[PDB]
Design an enzyme around this catalytic site. Structure first.
Site, PDB file in Angstrom:
ATOM      1  N   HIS B  47      -8.032  -0.108  -1.455  1.00 11.84           N
ATOM      2  CA  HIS B  47      -6.626  -0.166  -1.122  1.00 11.84           C
ATOM      3  C   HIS B  47      -6.262  -1.342  -0.200  1.00 11.84           C
ATOM      4  O   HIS B  47      -5.255  -2.036  -0.413  1.00 11.84           O
ATOM      5  CB  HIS B  47      -6.286   1.127  -0.456  1.00 11.84           C
ATOM      6  CG  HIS B  47      -4.844   1.302  -0.156  1.00 11.84           C
ATOM      7  ND1 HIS B  47      -4.402   1.558   1.109  1.00 11.84           N
ATOM      8  CD2 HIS B  47      -3.753   1.351  -0.965  1.00 11.84           C
ATOM      9  CE1 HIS B  47      -3.095   1.713   1.094  1.00 11.84           C
ATOM     10  NE2 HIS B  47      -2.681   1.638  -0.160  1.00 11.84           N
ATOM     11  N   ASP B  89      -0.884   1.708  -3.835  1.00 10.68           N
ATOM     12  CA  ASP B  89      -0.797   3.005  -3.166  1.00 10.68           C
ATOM     13  C   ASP B  89      -1.134   4.085  -4.182  1.00 10.68           C
ATOM     14  O   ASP B  89      -1.789   5.054  -3.832  1.00 10.68           O
ATOM     15  CB  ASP B  89       0.602   3.221  -2.650  1.00 10.68           C
ATOM     16  CG  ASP B  89       0.927   2.280  -1.486  1.00 10.68           C
ATOM     17  OD1 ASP B  89      -0.028   1.688  -0.935  1.00 10.68           O
ATOM     18  OD2 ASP B  89       2.102   2.202  -1.109  1.00 10.68           O
TER      19      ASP B  89
END
Lengths: 121, 121
Positions: B47, B89
Protein backbone atom coordinates in the site's frame (compact mmCIF):
# COMPACT_ATOMS: atom_id res chain seq x y z
CA UNK A 1 15.15 9.48 9.11
CA UNK A 2 11.94 8.20 10.57
CA UNK A 3 13.99 5.34 12.07
CA UNK A 4 16.18 7.63 14.12
CA UNK A 5 13.31 9.91 14.96
CA UNK A 6 11.08 7.10 16.26
CA UNK A 7 13.90 5.63 18.26
CA UNK A 8 14.64 8.98 19.85
CA UNK A 9 11.00 9.45 20.76
CA UNK A 10 10.81 6.06 22.38
CA UNK A 11 14.13 6.62 24.15
CA UNK A 12 13.16 9.92 25.56
CA UNK A 13 9.46 9.56 26.14
CA UNK A 14 9.17 5.79 26.82
CA UNK A 15 6.07 5.82 24.60
CA UNK A 16 5.45 3.93 21.39
CA UNK A 17 6.07 6.89 19.02
CA UNK A 18 3.48 5.86 16.43
CA UNK A 19 0.74 5.15 19.00
CA UNK A 20 1.35 8.26 21.05
CA UNK A 21 2.52 10.81 18.54
CA UNK A 22 1.64 9.47 15.14
CA UNK A 23 -1.72 11.21 15.16
CA UNK A 24 -1.82 13.67 18.01
CA UNK A 25 -3.25 17.20 17.93
CA UNK A 26 -2.53 19.35 14.84
CA UNK A 27 1.15 18.75 14.50
CA UNK A 28 2.15 15.40 15.80
CA UNK A 29 1.86 13.17 12.80
CA UNK A 30 1.64 13.20 9.07
CA UNK A 31 -0.96 15.97 8.47
CA UNK A 32 1.19 18.58 8.52
CA UNK A 33 0.72 21.59 10.90
CA UNK A 34 -2.02 23.38 12.80
CA UNK A 35 -2.25 25.70 15.80
CA UNK A 36 -1.00 23.53 18.63
CA UNK A 37 -3.63 22.06 21.00
CA UNK A 38 -1.24 21.69 23.96
CA UNK A 39 2.42 21.53 24.95
CA UNK A 40 2.97 18.11 23.29
CA UNK A 41 1.41 19.42 20.10
CA UNK A 42 3.65 22.49 20.24
CA UNK A 43 6.63 20.21 20.29
CA UNK A 44 5.54 18.71 17.06
CA UNK A 45 4.91 22.08 15.53
CA UNK A 46 8.44 23.22 16.28
CA UNK A 47 9.81 19.96 14.92
CA UNK A 48 8.06 20.41 11.57
CA UNK A 49 9.29 24.01 11.26
CA UNK A 50 12.67 22.74 12.20
CA UNK A 51 12.37 20.42 9.22
CA UNK A 52 11.47 23.42 6.94
CA UNK A 53 14.93 24.90 7.55
CA UNK A 54 17.05 21.99 6.26
CA UNK A 55 18.82 22.21 2.97
CA UNK A 56 17.87 19.40 0.66
CA UNK A 57 18.37 16.41 2.97
CA UNK A 58 15.24 14.26 3.28
CA UNK A 59 14.06 14.25 6.93
CA UNK A 60 11.94 11.13 6.29
CA UNK A 61 14.48 8.92 4.47
CA UNK A 62 17.91 10.26 5.25
CA UNK A 63 19.56 8.23 7.96
CA UNK A 64 22.04 9.81 10.38
CA UNK A 65 24.26 8.72 13.31
CA UNK A 66 23.49 9.63 16.85
CA UNK A 67 24.58 8.38 20.18
CA UNK A 68 22.53 7.46 23.22
CA UNK A 69 25.34 7.70 25.65
CA UNK A 70 24.39 8.12 29.27
CA UNK A 71 20.79 8.24 28.09
CA UNK A 72 21.21 11.53 26.25
CA UNK A 73 20.94 11.89 22.52
CA UNK A 74 24.19 13.10 20.95
CA UNK A 75 23.92 13.81 17.28
CA UNK A 76 26.95 12.58 15.47
CA UNK A 77 28.86 15.07 13.37
CA UNK A 78 27.39 13.50 10.21
CA UNK A 79 27.35 16.62 8.01
CA UNK A 80 25.51 20.01 8.21
CA UNK A 81 21.99 19.12 7.05
CA UNK A 82 22.05 15.70 8.61
CA UNK A 83 23.41 17.15 11.85
CA UNK A 84 20.62 19.75 11.88
CA UNK A 85 18.09 17.10 11.06
CA UNK A 86 19.34 15.04 13.99
CA UNK A 87 19.11 18.09 16.30
CA UNK A 88 15.49 18.62 15.13
CA UNK A 89 14.58 15.04 16.01
CA UNK A 90 16.45 15.23 19.30
CA UNK A 91 14.69 18.40 20.17
CA UNK A 92 11.23 16.97 19.50
CA UNK A 93 11.88 13.77 21.48
CA UNK A 94 13.17 15.82 24.43
CA UNK A 95 10.24 18.17 24.11
CA UNK A 96 7.68 15.38 23.97
CA UNK A 97 9.29 13.87 27.10
CA UNK A 98 9.30 17.18 28.93
CA UNK A 99 5.59 17.41 28.28
CA UNK A 100 4.38 13.95 29.15
CA UNK A 101 2.87 15.61 32.28
CA UNK A 102 0.07 17.20 30.14
CA UNK A 103 -0.05 14.62 27.31
CA UNK A 104 -3.70 14.06 26.62
CA UNK A 105 -4.94 11.06 24.72
CA UNK A 106 -8.11 12.98 23.76
CA UNK A 107 -5.81 14.66 21.22
CA UNK A 108 -5.20 11.37 19.45
CA UNK A 109 -7.13 10.85 16.22
CA UNK A 110 -7.85 8.24 13.54
CA UNK A 111 -9.56 11.02 12.06
CA UNK A 112 -7.69 13.98 10.44
CA UNK A 113 -7.55 16.82 12.97
CA UNK A 114 -9.71 19.89 13.34
CA UNK A 115 -7.15 22.62 13.39
CA UNK A 116 -6.69 26.33 13.01
CA UNK A 117 -3.98 27.44 10.61
CA UNK A 118 -0.48 27.26 11.91
CA UNK A 119 1.67 30.36 11.90
CA UNK A 120 4.19 30.25 9.06
CA UNK A 121 7.48 28.75 10.31
CA UNK B 1 -8.50 10.10 2.16
CA UNK B 2 -8.13 8.24 5.40
CA UNK B 3 -11.85 8.39 5.49
CA UNK B 4 -12.38 6.20 2.42
CA UNK B 5 -9.50 3.94 3.28
CA UNK B 6 -10.74 3.38 6.82
CA UNK B 7 -14.19 2.71 5.48
CA UNK B 8 -12.83 0.16 2.94
CA UNK B 9 -10.80 -1.52 5.61
CA UNK B 10 -13.83 -1.88 7.83
CA UNK B 11 -15.96 -3.11 4.90
CA UNK B 12 -13.40 -5.72 3.86
CA UNK B 13 -11.90 -6.77 7.12
CA UNK B 14 -14.86 -6.03 9.46
CA UNK B 15 -12.35 -4.66 11.99
CA UNK B 16 -11.97 -1.17 13.30
CA UNK B 17 -9.23 0.07 10.97
CA UNK B 18 -7.59 2.40 13.44
CA UNK B 19 -7.26 -0.09 16.24
CA UNK B 20 -6.34 -3.08 14.08
CA UNK B 21 -4.15 -1.53 11.42
CA UNK B 22 -3.41 2.04 12.46
CA UNK B 23 -0.12 0.96 14.14
CA UNK B 24 0.40 -2.61 12.99
CA UNK B 25 3.83 -4.05 12.35
CA UNK B 26 6.48 -2.00 10.55
CA UNK B 27 4.37 -0.80 7.65
CA UNK B 28 0.84 -0.19 8.73
CA UNK B 29 -0.12 3.25 9.77
CA UNK B 30 1.71 6.32 10.76
CA UNK B 31 5.53 6.40 10.60
CA UNK B 32 7.51 4.71 7.75
CA UNK B 33 8.08 1.46 5.89
CA UNK B 34 10.15 -1.32 7.41
CA UNK B 35 10.82 -4.94 6.74
CA UNK B 36 7.30 -6.39 6.93
CA UNK B 37 6.69 -8.57 9.98
CA UNK B 38 4.12 -10.76 8.24
CA UNK B 39 1.47 -11.00 5.49
CA UNK B 40 -0.74 -8.28 6.94
CA UNK B 41 2.26 -6.02 7.35
CA UNK B 42 3.24 -6.82 3.78
CA UNK B 43 -0.15 -5.59 2.57
CA UNK B 44 0.71 -2.24 4.14
CA UNK B 45 4.21 -2.18 2.64
CA UNK B 46 2.54 -2.66 -0.80
CA UNK B 47 0.00 0.00 0.00
CA UNK B 48 2.74 2.51 0.91
CA UNK B 49 4.59 1.64 -2.23
CA UNK B 50 1.40 2.11 -4.22
CA UNK B 51 0.99 5.54 -2.66
CA UNK B 52 4.46 6.50 -3.85
CA UNK B 53 3.43 6.02 -7.50
CA UNK B 54 0.58 8.60 -7.10
CA UNK B 55 0.86 11.78 -9.10
CA UNK B 56 -1.71 14.63 -8.70
CA UNK B 57 -3.05 13.85 -5.19
CA UNK B 58 -2.70 13.39 -1.39
CA UNK B 59 -3.90 10.02 0.09
CA UNK B 60 -4.22 11.38 3.52
CA UNK B 61 -6.55 14.33 2.81
CA UNK B 62 -7.91 13.97 -0.79
CA UNK B 63 -11.46 12.60 -0.90
CA UNK B 64 -12.49 10.30 -3.68
CA UNK B 65 -15.53 8.44 -4.87
CA UNK B 66 -15.99 4.70 -4.59
CA UNK B 67 -18.92 2.58 -4.03
CA UNK B 68 -19.47 -0.64 -2.17
CA UNK B 69 -21.57 -2.65 -4.55
CA UNK B 70 -22.52 -6.21 -3.72
CA UNK B 71 -19.83 -6.09 -1.09
CA UNK B 72 -17.11 -5.11 -3.46
CA UNK B 73 -15.15 -1.87 -3.50
CA UNK B 74 -15.63 -0.21 -6.83
CA UNK B 75 -13.47 2.81 -7.45
CA UNK B 76 -15.14 5.59 -9.34
CA UNK B 77 -13.64 6.94 -12.51
CA UNK B 78 -12.42 10.01 -10.54
CA UNK B 79 -9.46 11.75 -12.11
CA UNK B 80 -6.27 9.62 -12.84
CA UNK B 81 -4.65 10.05 -9.45
CA UNK B 82 -7.76 9.56 -7.34
CA UNK B 83 -8.73 6.50 -9.29
CA UNK B 84 -5.19 5.32 -8.57
CA UNK B 85 -5.37 6.36 -4.91
CA UNK B 86 -8.67 4.55 -4.63
CA UNK B 87 -7.25 1.45 -6.16
CA UNK B 88 -4.33 1.50 -3.73
CA UNK B 89 -6.69 1.67 -0.78
CA UNK B 90 -8.97 -1.03 -2.28
CA UNK B 91 -6.01 -3.32 -2.79
CA UNK B 92 -4.75 -2.94 0.78
CA UNK B 93 -8.28 -3.47 2.19
CA UNK B 94 -8.61 -6.67 0.21
CA UNK B 95 -5.10 -7.76 1.16
CA UNK B 96 -5.70 -7.15 4.84
CA UNK B 97 -8.92 -9.19 4.69
CA UNK B 98 -7.16 -11.96 2.70
CA UNK B 99 -4.57 -12.12 5.47
CA UNK B 100 -6.85 -11.99 8.49
CA UNK B 101 -5.82 -15.62 9.00
CA UNK B 102 -2.45 -14.52 10.31
CA UNK B 103 -3.30 -11.16 11.76
CA UNK B 104 -1.21 -10.98 14.91
CA UNK B 105 -2.31 -8.65 17.75
CA UNK B 106 1.26 -8.70 19.12
CA UNK B 107 2.04 -6.56 16.09
CA UNK B 108 -1.06 -4.40 16.55
CA UNK B 109 0.68 -1.59 18.38
CA UNK B 110 4.06 -2.90 17.43
CA UNK B 111 6.94 -0.74 18.60
CA UNK B 112 8.11 0.51 15.26
CA UNK B 113 11.62 1.45 16.62
CA UNK B 114 12.33 -2.33 16.52
CA UNK B 115 11.87 -2.56 12.73
CA UNK B 116 14.85 -2.65 10.49
CA UNK B 117 15.40 -0.93 7.12
CA UNK B 118 13.01 -2.03 4.38
CA UNK B 119 13.70 -2.73 0.75
CA UNK B 120 12.98 0.25 -1.49
CA UNK B 121 9.59 -0.01 -3.28
Amino acid sequence: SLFELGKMILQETGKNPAKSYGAYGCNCGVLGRGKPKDATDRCCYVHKCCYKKLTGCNPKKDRYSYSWKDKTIVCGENNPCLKELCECDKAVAICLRENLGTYNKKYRYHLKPFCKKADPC
